[PDB]
Scaffold this active site. Structure first.
Site, short mmCIF file in Angstrom:
data_model
loop_
_atom_site.label_atom_id
_atom_site.label_comp_id
_atom_site.label_asym_id
_atom_site.label_seq_id
_atom_site.Cartn_x
_atom_site.Cartn_y
_atom_site.Cartn_z
N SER A 56 48.33 25.20 53.15
CA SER A 56 49.07 24.92 51.91
C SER A 56 50.00 26.07 51.55
O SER A 56 49.78 27.21 51.87
CB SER A 56 48.14 24.63 50.75
OG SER A 56 47.31 25.74 50.47
N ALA A 62 51.15 28.25 48.46
CA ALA A 62 50.90 28.78 47.11
C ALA A 62 51.55 30.13 47.06
O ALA A 62 51.50 30.89 48.07
CB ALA A 62 49.41 28.89 46.79
N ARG A 63 52.20 30.50 45.96
CA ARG A 63 52.95 31.76 45.88
C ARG A 63 52.00 32.94 45.94
O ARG A 63 50.84 32.92 45.52
CB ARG A 63 53.75 31.79 44.59
CG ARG A 63 52.95 31.99 43.34
CD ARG A 63 53.83 31.87 42.13
NE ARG A 63 53.11 32.34 40.93
CZ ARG A 63 53.29 31.90 39.71
NH1 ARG A 63 54.08 30.85 39.45
NH2 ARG A 63 52.69 32.52 38.68
N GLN A 76 44.01 22.51 43.37
CA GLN A 76 44.60 22.74 44.68
C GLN A 76 43.55 23.00 45.73
O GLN A 76 42.49 23.60 45.42
CB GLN A 76 45.65 23.85 44.59
CG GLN A 76 46.75 23.53 43.59
CD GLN A 76 47.66 22.43 44.03
OE1 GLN A 76 47.23 21.29 44.15
NE2 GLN A 76 48.90 22.75 44.28
N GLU A 125 45.06 19.73 57.70
CA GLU A 125 46.50 19.50 57.88
C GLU A 125 46.89 19.56 59.33
O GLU A 125 47.76 18.79 59.77
CB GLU A 125 47.38 20.46 57.10
CG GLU A 125 47.53 20.14 55.57
CD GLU A 125 46.32 20.44 54.71
OE1 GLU A 125 45.33 21.03 55.19
OE2 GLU A 125 46.47 20.11 53.50
N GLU A 176 60.01 29.89 38.26
CA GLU A 176 59.25 28.76 38.81
C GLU A 176 60.10 27.47 38.90
O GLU A 176 61.23 27.37 38.49
CB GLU A 176 58.02 28.54 37.97
CG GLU A 176 57.02 29.62 37.91
CD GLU A 176 55.91 29.37 36.89
OE1 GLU A 176 55.98 28.45 35.96
OE2 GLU A 176 54.84 30.12 36.93
N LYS A 200 44.34 14.10 42.19
CA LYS A 200 45.08 15.30 42.50
C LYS A 200 46.54 15.01 42.85
O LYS A 200 47.39 15.86 42.54
CB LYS A 200 44.39 16.08 43.61
CG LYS A 200 45.15 17.24 44.18
CD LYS A 200 44.30 18.06 45.11
CE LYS A 200 45.08 19.11 45.89
NZ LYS A 200 46.14 18.47 46.72
#
Ligand SMILES: CC1=C(C(=O)O)[C@@H]2CC(C)(C)c3c(C)c(C)cc4c3N2[C@@]12C(=O)NC(=O)N=C2N4C[C@H](O)[C@H](O)[C@H](O)COP(=O)(O)O
Ligand SMILES: CC1=C(C(=O)O)[C@@H]2CC(C)(C)c3c(C)c(C)cc4c3N2[C@@]12C(=O)NC(=O)N=C2N4C[C@H](O)[C@H](O)[C@H](O)COP(=O)(O)O
Ligand SMILES: [K+]
Ligand SMILES: [K+]
Ligand SMILES: [K+]
Ligand SMILES: [K+]
Ligand SMILES: [Mn+2]
Ligand SMILES: [Mn+2]
Lengths: 500, 500
Positions: B167, B169-170, B187, B230, B279, B388
């Site tokens: 995934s 994510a920052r 998440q 994934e 953002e 989700k």
């Protein structure tokens, strides 16, 4: 005669601006003229002037489509509207709306009566015309009649003589000597009609003038206050008294240079089938005919080589968006200010199908009010939604000073990111609704009541201590010197004109 | 190696497409690279490749900005996304989203372990690197740190070994050997972190791989189901098993061709300051720092002449819109179908700052359900907002079959004209909210709950007997033969290319 004071001159101005296409081959008023105009409006092309209309006889009539629609370039986007008002073609929306509001704290300049004018060059009496034999357009394939009246001005006067109203309301041919049209509350034609009906003695003296001074058709499309005679407002706005000539068959007065004038009566008793029509919100409901007001025509006068203006209205962008939305927004801005609300600017986003108005708030003033979203939304909605100027508008979006309300992308950004659905909104069910919006007249609730909302896209600190963010954009997220460096090196690096 | 399977090849593909600008003069990672990228994203220009980054040492690193942003032309608008997936550059959004969904009813194709790859060409141990000494970008002037991680993939595995999640994510640099980042419910990185925390025995083995196979970064941005690895999904989508190499310091596996790999741990106990960051919704709130998750880096491996991809996110249009919005919409479409709802298409309009999803309804199927707006809105909202895949989305707009949900102008038209505010909507206050939307985390209500709505832009007869209008547009208001005549005569008359 100047372009803003004479429709014929306005047509010339559009030519000179390279904003006109003259079509001199035969064009059918049955759908073809309106289809071409519709395409023009959907693509922001040049206005079409149909000089060879199939069925034109004895001078009646040529058609100009798209008189108040958009131009393709950004730099003169609103140039056709500017040409209604003697403004430079590059005028901004703010400048156009300010011009339209300018007469609101000026003394009226009443009209001047003159003995004749171009509108008297030809006439047809009660035995010489037949409205079914004129090249009246069928504008949309499912329309319930041929809509002769999409861009003329109805002229009616209060029984006491003290108010003469000029307004746009649609009308279609009923038979050889009658029209039917919309006459619905709270519109001024309706308000005046009611006065005559309560008096009960006669039908309403009426005229409908097509191809009027452009400045006059703009005021005709604007919700200036009850009781205010549009002619004097336009006089003040333009700085000039408008020249009017008396009708032949009644004592109303029409612009001297009107292209075509119908004289007659608006019945206080009779109705006839009206609609359906392809309307401003982008729809037609085929077969939805309803009884409308009924007009009797007694006389036609017209200019040599008369030109009928036509709005082929519907989906974006045409006169029903550029004029109805923007001019309502203008009046709403003033109304808010007069009610002590800290509104600087108002515009009806085209993206909303001119059903929203975005209200830009002076947030320094807001902070001094020491109020809350709930309270402020209620106050704004009460002012606007209880007033005729708010009639057509179902959502108000409050935004702070960083948002340019004339830029729909920015209104949508602010709405989407700053207004929490439900919590940041106040619904208004006990206000007049605009039935022509499909979700009203063809929707799940009362056609004439409710369905309105104030959506607060002010952020919390805009009420207290001040904006507490910066945008994550090129403009706000980088220092000045760096931005300028980027710009100066942009093409050198390998990356990609104002007029376009 | 194909472009969709190897980031280095993807960069070549963008060059060959004339969709890349190589900048070989020194560029500052302190704001300048991100400013250029921001300008690119706001104007749909070519992706920038910064080959001469001030502070680059021993091969770390070049930057590619705007890897998943838009191209200027309509015809290949989504070409960069198509290049992530082996699709023609002219692929539609529907085709891209269908490709991303295709693996959902296929057997996974698990990855293949290989002994080495380009990501092992260089390494730096615990005594050889310092994250503060790398040319990590400051992306927005008010950011609370240098965000090294905007377009890499975090790799974490469940304690039991059965699920390996990839995934985006920052994360930002905390010190010489740590990052901080967002790890928030619901998440998958958070879900896995929770499993490790409840086990309580160790920090989470972790890797962060930058410049991974493009097909992999797309799945990394998509909310595929809980428990689904994934890598196997991407294998199935591409028809090929992905080649992975083991980390040196843990037993996780990274794409063989990764440009840069960080190996280490995600703490189950420690936090550190994180943010603020400019953002996806277009804002930064300067000074809004909060404790985030804390990552320890033990080892860096990298390709010769490594390239770091970067998203300079904020206002339209960047990866946070093209990928987060569209891929959530894709999953929502499937989720709705799996719940027996008659949804054909879903898209998150860019105009909504990807906070809305428009759901196109098969209204023949709807009519057979013999239901009502209230009931249907509730059912749709329950399905989506309790899942989700609906996390980031606060407004669902239901539209009928005439609307192309991939066209924001048409979604806005339908929303504005077919959904009566209040009455045609259902608010959801008892669902998880997305705190990063300003009206949530910086708004008037709970940051993490509510603020969601289903807005029904289906008209009443769409539930009963069928659509009862025609649009007042060129397409629908004129017969075929007339339209074609207008088109064929358009330039001849005097009025104004697909590729452009
Ligand atoms: C709503 C309208 C129309 C429609 O959409 O069918 C129809 C289409 C046409 C004729 C093209 C059209 C054009 C091209 C323009 C530019 C404006 C309108 C219209 N038509 C309508 C209509 O028939 N009935 C109506 O309620 N008001 C309309 N206006 C707006 C009014 O002019 C405005 O509200 C004024 O403020 C009214 O003047 P006052 O009462 O304040 O003095
Ligand atoms: C919301 C996000 C960001 C932000 O706006 O700050 C931030 C910006 C960046 C890093 C550029 C960014 C880019 C460029 C792209 C393309 C996607 C994201 C992000 N970042 C955030 C983030 O830091 N936290 C988060 O909640 N999810 C984000 N996503 C979206 C997730 O990847 C998506 O929800 C996946 O479905 C998650 O995978 P699973 O858990 O389902 O396996
Ligand atoms: K008026
Ligand atoms: K708000
Ligand atoms: K994922
Ligand atoms: K509805
Ligand atoms: Mn009036
Ligand atoms: Mn996952």
């Amino acid at each position: 005669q100047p372009a803003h004071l004479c429709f014929r001159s306005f047509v010339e101005a559009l030519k000179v601006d390279n904003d006109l296409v003259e079509i001199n081959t035969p064009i059918d008023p049955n759908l073809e003229a309106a289809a071409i105009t519709r395409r023009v409006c959907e693509t922001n092309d040049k206005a079409p002037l149909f000089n060879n209309l199939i069925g034109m006889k004895n001078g009646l009539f040529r058609i100009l489509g798209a008189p108040g629609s958009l131009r393709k370039s950004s730099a003169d986007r609103y140039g056709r509207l500017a040409r209604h008002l003697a403004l430079p073609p590059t005028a901004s929306m703010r400048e156009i709306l300010d011009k339209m509001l300018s007469a609101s704290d000026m003394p009226p300049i009443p009209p001047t009566i003159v003995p004749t004018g171009p509108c008297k060059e030809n006439s047809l009496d009660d035995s010489e015309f037949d409205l079914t034999e004129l090249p009246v357009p069928l504008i949309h394939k499912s329309d319930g009649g041929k809509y002769i009246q999409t861009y003329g001005m109805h002229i009616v006067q209060s029984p006491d003589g003290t108010w003469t109203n000029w307004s746009i309301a649609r009308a279609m041919v009923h038979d050889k000597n009658h029209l039917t049209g919309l006459v619905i509350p709270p519109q001024h034609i309706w308000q005046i009609h009611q006065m005559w009906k309560k008096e009960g003695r006669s039908d309403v003296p009426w005229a409908l003038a097509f191809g009027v001074p452009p400045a006059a058709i703009m005021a005709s499309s604007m919700p200036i206050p009850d009781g205010v005679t549009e002619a004097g407002y336009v006089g003040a706005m333009t700085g000039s008294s408008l020249e009017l000539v008396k009708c032949d068959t009644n004592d109303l007065y029409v612009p001297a240079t009107s292209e075509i004038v119908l004289e007659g009566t608006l019945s206080i008793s009779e109705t006839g089938p009206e609609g359906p029509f392809g309307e401003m919100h982008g729809y037609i409901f085929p077969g939805d005919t309803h009884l409308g007001a009924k007009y009797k025509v007694n006389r036609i006068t017209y200019r040599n080589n008369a030109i009928m203006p036509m709005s082929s209205c519907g989906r974006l962008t045409d006169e029903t968006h550029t004029m109805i939305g923007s001019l309502a927004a203008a009046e709403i801005r003033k109304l808010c200010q007069q009610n002590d609300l800290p509104i600087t600017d108002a515009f009806a986003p085209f993206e909303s199908q001119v059903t929203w108005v975005a209200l830009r708030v002076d947030t320094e003033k807001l902070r001094a009010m020491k109020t809350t979203s709930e309270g402020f939304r209620k106050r704004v909605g009460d002012v606007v939604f209880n007033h005729k100027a708010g009639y057509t508008i179902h959502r108000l979006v409050l935004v702070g000073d960083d948002i340019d309300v004339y830029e729909g992308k920015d209104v949508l950004w602010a709405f989407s990111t700053r207004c929490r659905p439900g919590m940041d909104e106040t619904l208004f069910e006990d206000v007049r609704g605009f039935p022509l919006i499909p979700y009203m007249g063809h929707g799940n609730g009362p056609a004439h009541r409710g369905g309105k909302v104030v959506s607060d896209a002010l952020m919390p600190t805009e009420y207290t201590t001040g904006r507490n963010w910066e945008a994550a954009d090129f403009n706000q997220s980088y220092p000045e010197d760096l931005k300028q460096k980027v710009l100066d090196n942009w093409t050198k690096m390998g990356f990609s004109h104002h007029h376009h």
